[PDB]
Amino acid sequence: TSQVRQNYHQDSEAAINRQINLELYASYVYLSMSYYFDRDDVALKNFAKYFLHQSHEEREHAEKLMKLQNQRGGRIFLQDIKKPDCDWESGLNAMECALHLEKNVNQSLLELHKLATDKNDPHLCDFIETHYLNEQVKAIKELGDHVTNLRKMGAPESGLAEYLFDKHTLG
Amino acid sequence: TSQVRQNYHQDSEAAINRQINLELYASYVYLSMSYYFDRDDVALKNFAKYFLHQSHEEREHAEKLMKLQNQRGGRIFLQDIKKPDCDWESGLNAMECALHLEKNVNQSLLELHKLATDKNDPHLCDFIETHYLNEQVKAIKELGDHVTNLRKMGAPESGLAEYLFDKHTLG
Amino acid sequence: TSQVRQNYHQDSEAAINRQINLELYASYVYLSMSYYFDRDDVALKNFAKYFLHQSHEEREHAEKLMKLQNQRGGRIFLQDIKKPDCDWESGLNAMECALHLEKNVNQSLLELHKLATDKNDPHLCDFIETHYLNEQVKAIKELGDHVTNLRKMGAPESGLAEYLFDKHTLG
Amino acid sequence: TSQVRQNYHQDSEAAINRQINLELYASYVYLSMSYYFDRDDVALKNFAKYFLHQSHEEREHAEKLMKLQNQRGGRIFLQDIKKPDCDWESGLNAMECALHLEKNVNQSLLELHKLATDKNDPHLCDFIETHYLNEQVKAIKELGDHVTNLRKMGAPESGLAEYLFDKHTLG
Amino acid sequence: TSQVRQNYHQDSEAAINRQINLELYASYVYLSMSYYFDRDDVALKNFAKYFLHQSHEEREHAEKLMKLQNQRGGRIFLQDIKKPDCDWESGLNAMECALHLEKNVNQSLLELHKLATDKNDPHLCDFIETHYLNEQVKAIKELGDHVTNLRKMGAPESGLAEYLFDKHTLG
Amino acid sequence: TSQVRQNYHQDSEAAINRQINLELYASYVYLSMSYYFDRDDVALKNFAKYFLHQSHEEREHAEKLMKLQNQRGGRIFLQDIKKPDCDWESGLNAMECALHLEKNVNQSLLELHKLATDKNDPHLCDFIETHYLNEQVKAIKELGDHVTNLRKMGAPESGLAEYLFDKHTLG
Ligand SMILES: [Cl-]
Ligand SMILES: [Cl-]
Ligand SMILES: [Cl-]
Ligand SMILES: [Cl-]
Ligand SMILES: [Cl-]
Ligand SMILES: [Cl-]
Ligand SMILES: [Fe+3]
Ligand SMILES: [Fe+3]
Ligand SMILES: [Fe+3]
Ligand SMILES: [Fe+3]
Ligand SMILES: [Fe+3]
Ligand SMILES: [Fe+3]
Ligand SMILES: [Fe+3]
Ligand SMILES: [Fe+3]
Ligand SMILES: [Fe+3]
Ligand SMILES: [Fe+3]
Ligand SMILES: [Fe+3]
Ligand SMILES: [Fe+3]
Ligand SMILES: [Fe+3]
Ligand SMILES: [Fe+3]
Ligand SMILES: [Mg+2]
Ligand SMILES: [Mg+2]
Ligand SMILES: [Mg+2]
Ligand SMILES: [Mg+2]
Ligand SMILES: [Mg+2]
Ligand SMILES: [Mg+2]
Ligand SMILES: [Mg+2]
Ligand SMILES: [Mg+2]
Ligand SMILES: [Mg+2]
Ligand SMILES: [Mg+2]
Ligand SMILES: [Mg+2]
Ligand SMILES: [Mg+2]
Ligand SMILES: [Mg+2]
Ligand SMILES: [Mg+2]
């Protein structure tokens, strides 16, 4: 029992542990997407850099939830990080799968907030709002914008489209 | 139907469209107040600059709600911007009408927040808190302070009062 | 009756009030065009910035006519700002509608100048020439140039065209 | 009755007055703790500076709640500041009493937030979250860390422990 | 019994403890005066800053007497800080009450010096002369100067007077 | 079949995929060790920073083997990252477990080199020598040095030992 713990429910402590695992899974998916574009048979350098930066951001999102667990007096509990569920076939197909991943992560964060509201934990509500909810909203909007451009340009059939998008939008 | 929309109720999307129209109406009122003080028969230069800056701020408040509608996957819907409801007769009477306008805009924002709370939209609650609620509180306090000074100085009878307030408080 | 008024006809004072309303209407149309390109299903960032800058310019054109009314001893009279008359369907269709708007605003300014010539108001003629007539001529030429490029590139069918125009001409 | 007051309940106005008194009491306790370490029979200079800085922070927390009362149109109501409830016997015993004080102040702030939630005051909820709740969480964690180090080093029996902690952790 | 104590009488040690309490009471009175001028129904910003600076100075006067108690080998003994004895009704009435407070604090310091002279404590006499007696003389003179200006200007009836004093003398 | 592949055996391509998984496992172990020292009941800040830096280094070791797979024309194949096998009980016990981990990673790299020598792959031998073998030798030596210091200082019984090591060697 922690000398610092106060107003922190056991169900919130477990939900934070489940959230950490998800953030580490998203980092793994973005790492797989990055090295697919570094292959000699795909070769889109800016797509690779974009997905590698997204992988590093998800690892920072996980480390800050681990900081929070200890700040409130909970105890961290880790599980296996699952292999990504997948072949990426093109620049367009990868951005669409990244859009569905960020919407999944956003649904979990909204569920975590409902729980923290039921347990009357206002410090935890503000933590989630401050550091996670507008970041997901901005990230999902950006991926939607990217998917729209690739399609209007002629992807996935026009191989010229993904090459020029690589230079102008990601470059 | 929007590929980015998530946890965003149709009633919240309509209430945001109504909010935009109000912000544009406040910009119009402040523009009318500014050019009344630029008249040769009134001639208070610092009152004119103060009200013109307030007009530009309300236009920025409107553009950021239009940014938000698109971020969440809603669709903007515009209506006519009504002519201001009015003659401004003095520096004091104009500050009192500006105080009643900012309290009207604050009542609408509080209603928008109650709705967003009923629909369990925590990203929208935090958006309103972060960018709108303490700004209205600071603005209403400032106008109250200004009205109190003009009255204690002898306005609207002392024409010396509004001249000296123009130089010391707004100058 | 104004201690500063001289050689300033009542018909010129009313025509200036009508001109102000038009400038504010053009600002509203350009604001609607800007946020259409910020939508997740269109996503042309440079088209959005171009139309937002045009909206701010029309608001400056209106504020300077309000300055002029007071300089000559007239009195400002405001009316409702009408909702824009419209769906924008593409980058090309929006530039064509902007070209027709700037030609409408130019026809009103030419009518205002004919009136000021009939009333032998040479200060008002020079004001319109100095600050409004070559600006409309330059603006209409620019929009004509933009429309010509989009068509020759394959718009509105080639979705690649509007993407590349966004980067090279507006970027 | 205040020309600026809006959506601000009498029960919230009284609870804010009670909160101010508590913040001033915490400043007084930290001032007593500081000068105990400045005594010739204790002589821990860095312990004295640490507790004096904590006293100044609590006085800033009180002044900002007094600013808030006036911002919302309430009226400040002051009571006597009670003498601290105490002999501090060592560096360890003082950090443990500071940990219990910061947890008491946090329980009052959580009660104030529940009240503001019942009265549907969202500006007051965000004020408390922004400026008070993560500060208490960070402060309680820091004191827990300090207590743990002193005990593991051999306090309160090892007089070497508190001397070396003074130089390395607070120095 | 203190290894450092020398030529320091028990009656001087108790009189220093009583002096500390008074300095903390003066800080509390100046804090109440400051936030009265921050109210929306008074609104004199420079009066508020002046009284807040005076509150911080009285807290420094108290901390230096606590430093002195320990320097000479005495032991600090704290009592409750009483609520201020009061409604401030105007800028003039507040300066007059501040003038009577600083004369009360000066009478206590003169009594403390008589005692230190009877006990032949020359280090304590010089301490009081160096750090306290000319400061009270300068402070009382300044308040007398301020009261004289407000009255000659027409206070408390002329509300213009306190506004202009706020800008010129305190601004 | 890869247009760039040359002198690169299928058994080497699989052994590189197994090596990647191990590097990611070591990053996970070092991340768990870091947040154990950030707990309020342990509180060794420099131990936490040391283990977090080691976690980031192992992730860089993995990304460079993924770069190498693609450089030679192989294809990356990912597996689940296993949860760490463990309670860390003290600073000493954690350094000893880190020493055994780095010796395990070194045994795998030596096996990978024997295989690359059997298949006469000299580019792969030099890659492993250049970027991995002296790094493990330096890392194992450093951990041995750390374990020796903690024991000679009195760990795990002397809680003073791990505190002072935290400040002098890691600080
Ligand atoms: Cl708890
Ligand atoms: Cl939805
Ligand atoms: Cl005329
Ligand atoms: Cl109210
Ligand atoms: Cl003595
Ligand atoms: Cl081969
Ligand atoms: Fe991201
Ligand atoms: Fe994330
Ligand atoms: Fe404003
Ligand atoms: Fe607004
Ligand atoms: Fe233009
Ligand atoms: Fe124009
Ligand atoms: Fe603190
Ligand atoms: Fe506090
Ligand atoms: Fe918030
Ligand atoms: Fe003073
Ligand atoms: Fe004093
Ligand atoms: Fe002297
Ligand atoms: Fe390492
Ligand atoms: Fe490694
Ligand atoms: Mg599996
Ligand atoms: Mg935010
Ligand atoms: Mg009407
Ligand atoms: Mg909330
Ligand atoms: Mg804020
Ligand atoms: Mg209509
Ligand atoms: Mg010209
Ligand atoms: Mg008592
Ligand atoms: Mg915060
Ligand atoms: Mg009493
Ligand atoms: Mg003498
Ligand atoms: Mg002197
Ligand atoms: Mg297992
Ligand atoms: Mg080498």
UniProtKB/Swiss-Prot annotation, chains A, B, C, D, E, F:
Illness the protein is tied to: Hemochromatosis 5: A disorder of iron metabolism characterized by iron overload. Excess iron is deposited in a variety of organs leading to their failure, and resulting in serious illnesses including cirrhosis, hepatomas, diabetes, cardiomyopathy, arthritis, and hypogonadotropic hypogonadism. Severe effects of the disease usually do not appear until after decades of progressive iron loading. Neurodegeneration with brain iron accumulation 9: An autosomal dominant neurodegenerative disorder associated with iron accumulation, primarily in the basal ganglia. It is characterized by global developmental delay apparent from infancy, and progressive decline of motor and cognitive skills. Clinical features include delayed walking or inability to walk, spasticity with hyperreflexia, ataxia, dystonia, and poor or absent language.
Keywords: Acetylation, Cytoplasm, Cytoplasmic vesicle, Iron, Iron storage, Lysosome, Metal-binding, Neurodegeneration, Oxidoreductase, Phosphoprotein
Similarity-based family: Belongs to the ferritin family.
UniProt-listed Enzyme Commission number(s): 1.16.3.1
UniProt xrefs under SUPFAM superfamilies: Ferritin-like
Enzyme class of the recorded protein, top EC level: oxidoreductase
Binding site residues for Fe cation 1: 23, 58, 61
SUBUNIT field: Oligomer of 24 subunits. There are two types of subunits: L (light) chain and H (heavy) chain. The major chain can be light or heavy, depending on the species and tissue type. In the human liver, the heavy chain is predominant. The functional molecule forms a roughly spherical shell with a diameter of 12 nm and contains a central cavity into which the insoluble mineral iron core is deposited. Interacts with NCOA4; NCOA4 promotes targeting of the iron-binding ferritin complex to autolysosomes following starvation or iron depletion.
GO cellular component, one term: extracellular region
Official protein name in the record: Ferritin heavy chain
GO biological process: immune response; intracellular iron ion homeostasis; iron ion transport; negative regulation of cell population proliferation; negative regulation of ferroptosis; negative regulation of fibroblast proliferation
Compartmental location: Cytoplasm; Lysosome; Cytoplasmic vesicle, Autophagosome
CDD domains: Euk_Ferritin
Physiological role: Stores iron in a soluble, non-toxic, readily available form. Important for iron homeostasis. Has ferroxidase activity. Iron is taken up in the ferrous form and deposited as ferric hydroxides after oxidation. Also plays a role in delivery of iron to cells. Mediates iron uptake in capsule cells of the developing kidney. Delivery to lysosomes is mediated by the cargo receptor NCOA4 for autophagic degradation and release of iron.
Effect on the protein upon substituting residue 102 to A: No effect on iron binding but the oxidation rate is severely reduced
Any Pfam family hit: Ferritin
Site, Essential for association with cargo receptor NCOA4: residue positions: 18
Source species, domain of life: Eukaryota
Listed PANTHER family: FERRITIN, FERRITIN HEAVY CHAIN
Tissue: Expressed in the liver.
Ferritin-like diiron domain segment(s): 6-154
Catalytically driven reaction(s): 4 Fe(2+) + O2 + 4 H(+) = 4 Fe(3+) + 2 H2O
Xref: InterPro entries: Ferritin (IPR001519), Ferritin-like (IPR012347), Ferritin-like_diiron (IPR009040), Ferritin-like_SF (IPR009078), Ferritin_CS (IPR014034), Ferritin_DPS_dom (IPR008331)
PROSITE patterns given in the database record: FERRITIN_1 (PS00540), FERRITIN_2 (PS00204), FERRITIN_LIKE (PS50905)
Binding, Fe cation 2: 58, 102, 136
MF (Gene Ontology): ferric iron binding; ferrous iron binding; ferroxidase activity; identical protein binding; iron ion binding; iron ion sequestering activity
